Amino acid sequence: FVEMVDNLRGKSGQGYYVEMTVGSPPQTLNILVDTGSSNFAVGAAPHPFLHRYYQRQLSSTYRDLRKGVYVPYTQGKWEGELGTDLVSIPHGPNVTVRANIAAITESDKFFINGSNWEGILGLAYAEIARPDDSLEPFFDSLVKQTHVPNLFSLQLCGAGFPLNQSEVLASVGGSMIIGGIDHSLYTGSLWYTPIRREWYYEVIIVRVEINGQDLKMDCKEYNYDKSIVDSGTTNLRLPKKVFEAAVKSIKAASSTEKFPDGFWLGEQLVCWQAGTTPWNIFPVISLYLMGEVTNQSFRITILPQQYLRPVEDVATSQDDCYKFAISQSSTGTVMGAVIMEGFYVVFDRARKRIGFAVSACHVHDEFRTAAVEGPFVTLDMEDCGYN
Amino acid sequence: FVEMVDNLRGKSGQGYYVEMTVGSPPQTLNILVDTGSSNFAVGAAPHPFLHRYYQRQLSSTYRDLRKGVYVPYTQGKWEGELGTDLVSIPHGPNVTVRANIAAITESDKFFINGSNWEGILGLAYAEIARPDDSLEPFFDSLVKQTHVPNLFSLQLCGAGFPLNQSEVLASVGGSMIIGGIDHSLYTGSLWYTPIRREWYYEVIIVRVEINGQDLKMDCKEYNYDKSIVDSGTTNLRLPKKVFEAAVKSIKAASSTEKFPDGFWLGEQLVCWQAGTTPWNIFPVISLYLMGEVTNQSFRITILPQQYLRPVEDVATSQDDCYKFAISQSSTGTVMGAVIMEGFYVVFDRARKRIGFAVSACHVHDEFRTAAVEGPFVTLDMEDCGYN
Ligand SMILES: CCCCN(C)C(=O)n1cc(C(=O)N[C@@H](Cc2cc(F)cc(F)c2)[C@H](O)CNCc2cccc(OC)c2)c2cc(C#N)ccc21
Ligand SMILES: CCCCN(C)C(=O)n1cc(C(=O)N[C@@H](Cc2cc(F)cc(F)c2)[C@H](O)CNCc2cccc(OC)c2)c2cc(C#N)ccc21
């Protein structure tokens, strides 16, 4: 799948995107890769943050569905007009599909200044598509209309340092392999967790450790009210009780240095002299996931290099600065972009499972790397799912 | 070396011993394996703790050197009479050696009741032999007089739980492979550190971590005034400054549970309800050792299953009880039996180096294992040696 390697650009703070074309003749647009939703939508009218948009009147293959659509996400939202058009992915499979497209005409806190993307590719399942589940998501259309196998995999590559507008445009941000798995993108074994239900990419977390120390919560707390894999969100997002426990434990592990409350609240940066970030004082975080074999689990392990997101200094000094990329969630557990940066993630829709392997592009140091390890004989895993 | 596999009995608290014979006809004696000294010495007169002893008058091959010897160890000591006699190792190489033997006639806090050993085999170099370096140590005699290669290796096997008197007598305590390496005794790769000077088996520690967190001391502190590998001592022993930092850090890492000071002083037991020992709250300890390649180091990682030593619960309960097997040292760093239990240790005298590999009999849990890992780029490491 060499043609699809390195087809992504962007970063965790603003999103990872793929180049797509819509319409006839092709209109090129940059599209956010979002495993956390199921609508394919593009800017279709001028916006202060868009440098280009979808022009339906210029596409001869545009079909009007005569229907409005409203999509509220947790914080941002948009409103649009539904239609269909021919769609291609220049650095994807050699195919053209007719897919539903929501032409965005109004939005609030959706588009991101300087992100270089003009649309969103919702890669999850029909159940969470708006207006309802009859609006067939793009990936479903792709599989139905082509011979592309029913799976995709994602390698999101964090740089480990801040990127300005110029750098981010010229830097490779990762890979989206549509229809397969590319072996150059990972090391070690792929470990698979079942997709609990095909709506979001929902998984079940059975155990959490901070530097090997068990948080020792009822596992239902880890999945309350769901746990999802979401490339459309920056942070590891954790339910209230889990967040508080995790933060207390991370603070205690790293207590040789003190940080303001605002840092732990995800709001303010901390800076260190160039090169002197004390990675070793911060713990690793292991999430144990339900295995495919009964009574088995595996674990994925992330470093502070994942959960501390590089940010530019307010000064823009030689210092190395970061934000705490773990937040309290109103929506259950979310494995956002900063988690996904540690791993090659395989969305095996065909076998209703998600694969994890250590990413060939994850940021680490000489002393520690991200890990995917198993098996473990685990307690009563099904019970960890919330109802 | 199949004949020598499983030729050890014992445990960390009382010593690991090998069967030997001395004199003509052969007198069978159990002998403590001690890499921390250089005198071969045996009980030679009745003692409350000895069920048998060396009877020089009954040996036709006994030679009386007409000279006294006094050996003070840190806490224990003995005096005796020097001589030579023929020595063999029934479950060792098929050879007979004429070796120096100190016939112990008086002792204080040396013999251990119930240990089942009657003598000591000092396997270190002539430099620390008493009365002086002219008294050829046993291993030197063995190599000089036979075709046995100048190398031995040790696998000390801790049970991970208490053994009673009959249990320790009927259990395999490990292997002393004289003249070679047995591949069934380890997993992974052997990593070698240089022997700094041929007296004690002296090594250089270049970095110490507690759960990945750097103790952040000048590396000379870890080797002040020396660091040795010592099977004749139970604990990991650390110079005052290193000990204080380590205990602080281990208390910090295990802080969710509080223990009396006397536990941390290695004096008192801590007990938990049967099977409930909270291994996960205790940190791993990594000792980085100087590599053979310039600017290269490797690390050995021990678990709490190594540094918490199982001791019997003498009360009516079924508790699992332990002592803290890390002590403050007046004599530099000592890698005692509890450390060695984690690893297969190769005393490669011929190449002036010590090999470490994960032991096939180390105690662990399903979440963590002991490790031997490298390489790490490390600088100015000869600077870590004390002068
Ligand atoms: C890599 C993204 C760049 C940075 N941004 C904008 C973000 O970190 N975030 C993206 C979120 C979000 O809500 N993401 C959308 C996509 C999105 C990306 C973006 F770019 C700007 C947006 F409007 C939205 C996912 O799809 C959510 N999945 C669950 C869900 C929640 C609610 C409705 C859903 O289905 C329609 C799905 C989001 C939510 C919270 C909360 N609470 C905090 C930060 C968030
Ligand atoms: C196999 C462990 C059984 C339990 N015991 C008795 C011990 O834990 N220990 C053994 C020690 C000790 O001093 N060991 C001797 C051997 C020994 C074993 C035994 F069985 C009873 C003993 F008399 C002695 C080594 O040889 C020391 N190497 C450096 C050195 C220090 C001073 C002089 C030296 O060369 C002569 C060497 C020792 C020292 C301290 C101190 N400080 C604390 C505990 C110690």
Short mmCIF file of C-alpha atoms in Angstrom, two decimals, chain B:
data_model
loop_
_atom_site.label_atom_id
_atom_site.label_comp_id
_atom_site.label_asym_id
_atom_site.label_seq_id
_atom_site.Cartn_x
_atom_site.Cartn_y
_atom_site.Cartn_z
CA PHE B 1 26.88 -29.23 32.04
CA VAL B 2 23.70 -31.26 32.64
CA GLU B 3 25.47 -32.94 35.58
CA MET B 4 25.83 -29.56 37.35
CA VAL B 5 22.31 -28.25 36.73
CA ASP B 6 20.31 -28.04 39.99
CA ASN B 7 23.38 -28.67 42.20
CA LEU B 8 22.51 -25.88 44.67
CA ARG B 9 20.19 -25.80 47.69
CA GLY B 10 19.25 -22.98 50.06
CA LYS B 11 17.62 -19.54 50.03
CA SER B 12 18.57 -15.85 50.24
CA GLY B 13 18.18 -15.53 54.02
CA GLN B 14 20.53 -18.42 54.93
CA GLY B 15 22.74 -18.88 51.86
CA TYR B 16 23.00 -21.14 48.82
CA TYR B 17 25.32 -24.12 49.19
CA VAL B 18 26.99 -26.82 47.08
CA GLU B 19 28.00 -30.34 48.14
CA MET B 20 31.76 -30.92 48.31
CA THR B 21 34.05 -33.63 49.68
CA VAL B 22 37.33 -33.05 51.51
CA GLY B 23 40.10 -35.45 52.50
CA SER B 24 40.72 -39.18 52.17
CA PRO B 25 38.49 -41.01 52.51
CA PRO B 26 36.07 -38.26 51.28
CA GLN B 27 34.27 -36.27 53.98
CA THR B 28 31.03 -34.85 52.60
CA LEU B 29 30.28 -31.24 53.57
CA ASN B 30 27.81 -28.62 52.37
CA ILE B 31 29.60 -25.41 51.44
CA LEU B 32 28.19 -21.86 51.12
CA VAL B 33 28.75 -20.30 47.68
CA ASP B 34 30.33 -16.88 48.34
CA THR B 35 31.43 -14.58 45.49
CA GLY B 36 32.11 -11.88 48.14
CA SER B 37 35.23 -13.44 49.73
CA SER B 38 38.29 -15.57 48.83
CA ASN B 39 38.85 -18.10 51.62
CA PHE B 40 37.79 -21.76 51.50
CA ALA B 41 37.00 -22.60 55.13
CA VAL B 42 35.15 -25.38 56.92
CA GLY B 43 33.92 -26.12 60.45
CA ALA B 44 36.58 -28.37 62.01
CA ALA B 45 35.36 -28.80 65.62
CA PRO B 46 31.92 -29.32 67.18
CA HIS B 47 29.50 -26.39 67.08
CA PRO B 48 25.81 -26.20 68.10
CA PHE B 49 24.83 -25.32 64.50
CA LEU B 50 26.92 -28.01 62.79
CA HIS B 51 25.68 -31.59 62.38
CA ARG B 52 29.02 -32.51 60.83
CA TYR B 53 32.48 -31.06 60.46
CA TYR B 54 35.92 -31.65 58.95
CA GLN B 55 38.00 -34.19 60.86
CA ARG B 56 41.61 -33.58 59.86
CA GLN B 57 42.88 -36.54 61.92
CA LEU B 58 40.72 -38.84 59.76
CA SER B 59 42.18 -37.56 56.48
CA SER B 60 45.33 -39.30 55.21
CA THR B 61 45.89 -36.52 52.67
CA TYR B 62 45.65 -33.63 55.14
CA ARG B 63 48.65 -31.25 55.24
CA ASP B 64 49.12 -28.93 58.22
CA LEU B 65 50.53 -25.54 57.23
CA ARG B 66 51.25 -24.77 60.96
CA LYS B 67 49.67 -21.32 60.63
CA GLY B 68 46.65 -19.54 62.07
CA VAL B 69 44.20 -17.44 60.09
CA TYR B 70 41.62 -14.87 61.16
CA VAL B 71 38.82 -13.68 58.88
CA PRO B 72 36.53 -10.85 59.98
CA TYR B 73 33.58 -10.27 57.65
CA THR B 74 31.33 -7.23 58.22
CA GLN B 75 29.23 -8.75 61.04
CA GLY B 76 30.47 -12.37 61.37
CA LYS B 77 33.94 -13.85 61.91
CA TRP B 78 36.01 -16.99 62.45
CA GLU B 79 39.53 -18.14 63.23
CA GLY B 80 41.18 -21.38 62.28
CA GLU B 81 44.18 -23.38 61.21
CA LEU B 82 45.56 -23.39 57.68
CA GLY B 83 46.24 -26.56 55.75
CA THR B 84 45.68 -28.25 52.40
CA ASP B 85 43.76 -31.35 51.37
CA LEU B 86 42.16 -33.01 48.36
CA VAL B 87 38.77 -31.56 47.38
CA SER B 88 36.08 -32.66 44.91
CA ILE B 89 32.62 -31.46 43.86
CA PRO B 90 30.34 -34.53 43.39
CA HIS B 91 27.90 -32.55 41.18
CA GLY B 92 30.59 -30.44 39.53
CA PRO B 93 33.45 -31.21 37.13
CA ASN B 94 35.03 -34.67 37.45
CA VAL B 95 38.26 -33.54 39.12
CA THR B 96 40.20 -33.60 42.40
CA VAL B 97 42.03 -30.45 43.53
CA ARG B 98 44.63 -29.92 46.23
CA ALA B 99 43.39 -26.70 47.78
CA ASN B 100 44.00 -24.48 50.79
CA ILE B 101 41.49 -25.08 53.58
CA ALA B 102 41.05 -23.14 56.77
CA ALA B 103 39.91 -25.48 59.55
CA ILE B 104 37.57 -23.29 61.61
CA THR B 105 38.18 -23.76 65.34
CA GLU B 106 36.44 -20.64 66.76
CA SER B 107 33.66 -18.43 65.34
CA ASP B 108 31.17 -15.66 66.14
CA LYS B 109 27.90 -15.06 64.22
CA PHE B 110 29.26 -17.05 61.27
CA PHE B 111 27.42 -20.40 61.18
CA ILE B 112 23.65 -20.18 60.75
CA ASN B 113 21.32 -22.61 62.51
CA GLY B 114 19.28 -24.70 60.05
CA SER B 115 21.22 -23.43 56.98
CA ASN B 116 22.51 -26.98 56.38
CA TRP B 117 26.00 -25.74 55.46
CA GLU B 118 29.28 -26.34 57.29
CA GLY B 119 31.77 -24.21 55.37
CA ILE B 120 32.31 -21.38 52.91
CA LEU B 121 33.69 -21.25 49.38
CA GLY B 122 35.16 -17.82 48.73
CA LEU B 123 35.15 -17.49 44.96
CA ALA B 124 36.65 -14.01 44.64
CA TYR B 125 40.32 -13.18 44.01
CA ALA B 126 43.59 -13.60 45.96
CA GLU B 127 43.80 -9.87 46.69
CA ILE B 128 41.23 -10.18 49.52
CA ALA B 129 42.27 -13.63 50.85
CA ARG B 130 43.45 -13.81 54.47
CA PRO B 131 46.15 -13.76 55.82
CA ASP B 132 47.29 -12.29 52.47
CA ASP B 133 47.25 -12.81 48.69
CA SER B 134 49.77 -15.68 48.86
CA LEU B 135 46.96 -17.99 50.03
CA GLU B 136 45.70 -19.29 46.67
CA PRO B 137 41.87 -19.28 46.52
CA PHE B 138 40.03 -22.49 45.61
CA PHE B 139 38.98 -21.48 42.10
CA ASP B 140 42.54 -20.48 41.16
CA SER B 141 43.76 -23.89 42.38
CA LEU B 142 40.99 -25.59 40.34
CA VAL B 143 41.86 -23.80 37.07
CA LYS B 144 45.63 -24.25 37.53
CA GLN B 145 45.38 -27.97 38.30
CA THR B 146 42.69 -29.03 35.78
CA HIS B 147 41.40 -28.28 32.23
CA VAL B 148 38.33 -26.51 33.71
CA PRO B 149 37.83 -23.16 31.90
CA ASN B 150 38.35 -20.01 33.98
CA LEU B 151 34.63 -19.22 34.36
CA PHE B 152 31.67 -20.11 36.54
CA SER B 153 28.03 -19.10 36.42
CA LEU B 154 25.32 -18.87 39.07
CA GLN B 155 21.55 -19.25 38.97
CA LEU B 156 20.19 -18.68 42.47
CA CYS B 157 16.49 -19.59 42.66
CA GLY B 158 14.31 -17.91 45.29
CA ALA B 159 10.94 -19.63 45.81
CA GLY B 160 8.91 -16.42 46.10
CA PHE B 161 7.40 -17.81 49.31
CA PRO B 162 8.68 -19.31 52.58
CA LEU B 163 10.20 -22.79 52.71
CA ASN B 164 10.33 -24.82 55.93
CA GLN B 165 13.34 -26.92 56.98
CA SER B 166 12.29 -30.09 55.13
CA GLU B 167 11.14 -28.09 52.09
CA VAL B 168 14.47 -26.31 51.66
CA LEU B 169 16.27 -29.67 52.02
CA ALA B 170 14.07 -31.26 49.32
CA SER B 171 14.00 -28.34 46.87
CA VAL B 172 16.37 -27.33 44.08
CA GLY B 173 17.94 -23.99 45.06
CA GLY B 174 19.67 -23.37 41.72
CA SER B 175 22.81 -24.11 39.70
CA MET B 176 26.51 -23.50 39.90
CA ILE B 177 27.95 -24.24 36.48
CA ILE B 178 31.67 -24.62 36.93
CA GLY B 179 33.66 -23.99 33.76
CA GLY B 180 30.77 -22.89 31.58
CA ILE B 181 27.35 -21.50 30.74
CA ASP B 182 24.09 -23.44 30.50
CA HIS B 183 21.52 -21.93 28.13
CA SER B 184 18.50 -23.49 29.86
CA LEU B 185 19.16 -21.24 32.89
CA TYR B 186 18.28 -17.93 31.23
CA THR B 187 16.07 -16.25 28.64
CA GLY B 188 17.02 -13.39 26.31
CA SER B 189 20.58 -12.14 25.87
CA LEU B 190 23.54 -12.03 28.21
CA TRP B 191 24.87 -8.51 28.76
CA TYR B 192 28.41 -8.07 30.08
CA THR B 193 29.90 -5.45 32.36
CA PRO B 194 33.68 -5.18 32.97
CA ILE B 195 35.23 -6.41 36.22
CA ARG B 196 36.83 -3.14 37.36
CA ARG B 197 39.58 -4.76 39.46
CA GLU B 198 40.20 -8.39 40.32
CA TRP B 199 39.67 -8.44 44.07
CA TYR B 200 36.03 -8.57 44.83
CA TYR B 201 33.91 -9.02 41.74
CA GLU B 202 33.81 -5.19 41.35
CA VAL B 203 31.54 -3.49 38.83
CA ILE B 204 30.53 0.09 38.02
CA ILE B 205 26.92 1.33 38.31
CA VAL B 206 26.31 4.34 36.02
CA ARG B 207 22.61 5.14 36.58
CA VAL B 208 19.84 4.14 38.98
CA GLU B 209 16.07 4.42 38.32
CA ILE B 210 13.04 3.83 40.53
CA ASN B 211 10.05 3.10 38.23
CA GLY B 212 11.91 4.86 35.39
CA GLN B 213 12.62 7.93 37.51
CA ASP B 214 16.31 8.86 37.65
CA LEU B 215 17.68 9.05 41.21
CA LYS B 216 19.73 11.88 39.67
CA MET B 217 22.90 11.45 41.71
CA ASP B 218 26.53 11.86 40.70
CA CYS B 219 27.25 8.28 39.59
CA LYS B 220 30.31 8.11 41.89
CA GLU B 221 27.76 7.96 44.72
CA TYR B 222 26.45 4.61 43.47
CA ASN B 223 29.98 3.12 43.64
CA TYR B 224 31.24 4.67 46.88
CA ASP B 225 33.59 3.23 47.79
CA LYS B 226 32.97 0.16 45.58
CA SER B 227 30.15 -1.90 44.00
CA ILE B 228 30.39 -5.70 44.22
CA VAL B 229 28.44 -8.85 43.27
CA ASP B 230 28.11 -10.85 46.50
CA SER B 231 26.22 -14.18 46.85
CA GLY B 232 27.35 -14.41 50.50
CA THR B 233 25.05 -11.57 51.58
CA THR B 234 21.22 -11.54 51.49
CA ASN B 235 20.33 -7.93 50.69
CA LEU B 236 20.82 -5.25 48.15
CA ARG B 237 23.06 -2.96 50.20
CA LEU B 238 23.47 0.72 49.27
CA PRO B 239 25.81 3.52 50.41
CA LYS B 240 24.12 5.86 52.92
CA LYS B 241 23.22 8.65 50.43
CA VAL B 242 21.92 6.21 47.76
CA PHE B 243 19.98 4.24 50.40
CA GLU B 244 18.22 7.36 51.74
CA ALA B 245 17.22 8.52 48.23
CA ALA B 246 16.07 5.01 47.21
CA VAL B 247 13.96 4.48 50.36
CA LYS B 248 12.42 7.97 49.99
CA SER B 249 11.59 7.22 46.34
CA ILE B 250 10.22 3.72 47.12
CA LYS B 251 8.12 5.18 49.95
CA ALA B 252 6.88 7.86 47.52
CA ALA B 253 6.02 5.25 44.84
CA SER B 254 4.25 2.99 47.36
CA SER B 255 2.63 5.85 49.30
CA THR B 256 -1.01 4.60 48.92
CA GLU B 257 -0.04 2.25 51.77
CA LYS B 258 2.04 3.20 54.82
CA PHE B 259 4.46 0.94 56.69
CA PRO B 260 6.32 1.35 60.04
CA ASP B 261 9.94 2.67 59.92
CA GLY B 262 11.19 -0.70 61.22
CA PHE B 263 10.06 -2.37 58.01
CA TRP B 264 12.11 0.09 55.92
CA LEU B 265 15.04 -0.64 58.23
CA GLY B 266 14.85 -4.31 57.24
CA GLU B 267 14.08 -5.33 60.81
CA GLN B 268 10.31 -5.97 60.93
CA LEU B 269 7.93 -7.99 58.80
CA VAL B 270 5.04 -6.68 56.83
CA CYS B 271 2.18 -9.13 56.34
CA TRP B 272 -0.85 -9.13 54.07
CA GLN B 273 -3.96 -11.34 53.97
CA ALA B 274 -3.13 -14.54 52.00
CA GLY B 275 -2.53 -13.81 48.32
CA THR B 276 -3.20 -10.06 48.60
CA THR B 277 0.37 -8.71 48.51
CA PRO B 278 0.02 -5.45 46.51
CA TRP B 279 3.06 -5.96 44.25
CA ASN B 280 1.80 -3.29 41.83
CA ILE B 281 2.15 -0.44 44.35
CA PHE B 282 5.91 -1.12 44.71
CA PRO B 283 8.25 0.25 42.02
CA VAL B 284 10.81 -1.59 39.89
CA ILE B 285 14.48 -0.69 40.39
CA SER B 286 16.84 -0.45 37.43
CA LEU B 287 20.59 -0.51 37.86
CA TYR B 288 22.54 0.61 34.81
CA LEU B 289 25.91 -1.07 34.44
CA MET B 290 28.92 -0.05 32.33
CA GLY B 291 29.04 -1.91 29.02
CA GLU B 292 32.02 -3.50 27.28
CA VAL B 293 31.64 -1.15 24.29
CA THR B 294 32.87 2.42 24.93
CA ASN B 295 30.03 4.83 25.87
CA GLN B 296 27.61 1.90 26.11
CA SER B 297 25.60 0.76 29.13
CA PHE B 298 22.85 -1.78 29.80
CA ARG B 299 20.34 -2.11 32.64
CA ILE B 300 19.11 -4.80 34.97
CA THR B 301 15.60 -4.38 36.36
CA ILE B 302 14.42 -6.03 39.56
CA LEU B 303 10.87 -6.34 40.87
CA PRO B 304 9.54 -6.05 44.42
CA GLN B 305 9.35 -9.86 44.19
CA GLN B 306 13.16 -9.60 44.41
CA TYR B 307 13.64 -6.87 47.06
CA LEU B 308 10.83 -8.07 49.35
CA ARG B 309 12.05 -11.28 50.95
CA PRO B 310 9.44 -13.96 51.88
CA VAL B 311 9.49 -14.98 55.56
CA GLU B 312 7.17 -17.39 57.41
CA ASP B 313 4.00 -16.24 59.20
CA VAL B 314 4.47 -18.03 62.56
CA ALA B 315 1.03 -16.94 63.83
CA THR B 316 -2.26 -18.84 63.31
CA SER B 317 -3.14 -16.74 60.21
CA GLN B 318 -2.40 -17.56 56.54
CA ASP B 319 -0.73 -14.19 55.81
CA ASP B 320 2.01 -13.69 53.24
CA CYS B 321 4.88 -11.90 55.03
CA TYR B 322 8.11 -10.24 53.85
CA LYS B 323 11.12 -8.25 54.97
CA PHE B 324 12.48 -5.29 53.05
CA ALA B 325 15.71 -6.69 51.53
CA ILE B 326 17.45 -3.37 50.91
CA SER B 327 19.88 -2.16 53.60
CA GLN B 328 22.22 0.76 54.23
CA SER B 329 25.86 -0.18 53.64
CA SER B 330 29.14 0.93 55.25
CA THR B 331 31.13 -0.98 52.59
CA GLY B 332 29.77 0.37 49.29
CA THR B 333 27.09 -1.11 47.02
CA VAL B 334 26.47 -4.84 47.46
CA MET B 335 24.43 -6.84 44.95
CA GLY B 336 23.43 -9.61 47.33
CA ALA B 337 21.50 -12.87 46.90
CA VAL B 338 18.07 -11.19 46.40
CA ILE B 339 19.41 -9.29 43.38
CA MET B 340 21.20 -12.36 42.00
CA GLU B 341 17.93 -14.35 42.26
CA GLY B 342 16.57 -12.20 39.42
CA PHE B 343 19.39 -13.17 37.06
CA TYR B 344 21.71 -15.78 35.65
CA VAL B 345 25.12 -14.34 36.52
CA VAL B 346 28.24 -15.31 34.57
CA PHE B 347 31.58 -14.79 36.33
CA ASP B 348 33.74 -14.73 33.22
CA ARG B 349 37.12 -14.48 34.91
CA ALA B 350 38.92 -15.37 31.65
CA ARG B 351 37.58 -12.23 29.95
CA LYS B 352 37.44 -10.06 33.13
CA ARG B 353 33.69 -9.45 32.85
CA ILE B 354 30.38 -10.31 34.49
CA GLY B 355 27.35 -11.42 32.44
CA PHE B 356 23.70 -10.82 33.36
CA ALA B 357 20.60 -12.39 31.85
CA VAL B 358 17.00 -12.74 33.07
CA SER B 359 16.86 -15.94 35.14
CA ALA B 360 14.62 -18.82 34.06
CA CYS B 361 13.72 -19.14 37.76
CA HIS B 362 13.08 -15.50 38.75
CA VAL B 363 9.88 -14.71 40.69
CA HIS B 364 7.40 -12.36 39.03
CA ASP B 365 3.68 -11.79 38.32
CA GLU B 366 1.69 -11.75 35.07
CA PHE B 367 2.12 -7.94 34.77
CA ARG B 368 5.90 -7.40 35.10
CA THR B 369 9.13 -9.39 34.73
CA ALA B 370 12.77 -8.78 35.63
CA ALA B 371 14.72 -7.49 32.61
CA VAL B 372 18.22 -7.18 31.17
CA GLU B 373 18.14 -4.54 28.42
CA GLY B 374 20.43 -2.43 26.24
CA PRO B 375 22.28 -0.69 24.82
CA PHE B 376 22.12 2.86 26.18
CA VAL B 377 24.45 5.63 25.06
CA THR B 378 26.10 6.81 28.29
CA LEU B 379 29.09 9.15 28.77
CA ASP B 380 32.11 9.56 31.10
CA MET B 381 31.33 6.23 32.80
CA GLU B 382 34.86 5.50 34.09
CA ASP B 383 34.22 8.72 36.05
CA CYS B 384 31.59 6.73 37.98
CA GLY B 385 34.32 4.62 39.56
CA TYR B 386 35.48 5.76 42.97
CA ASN B 387 39.15 6.41 43.73
#
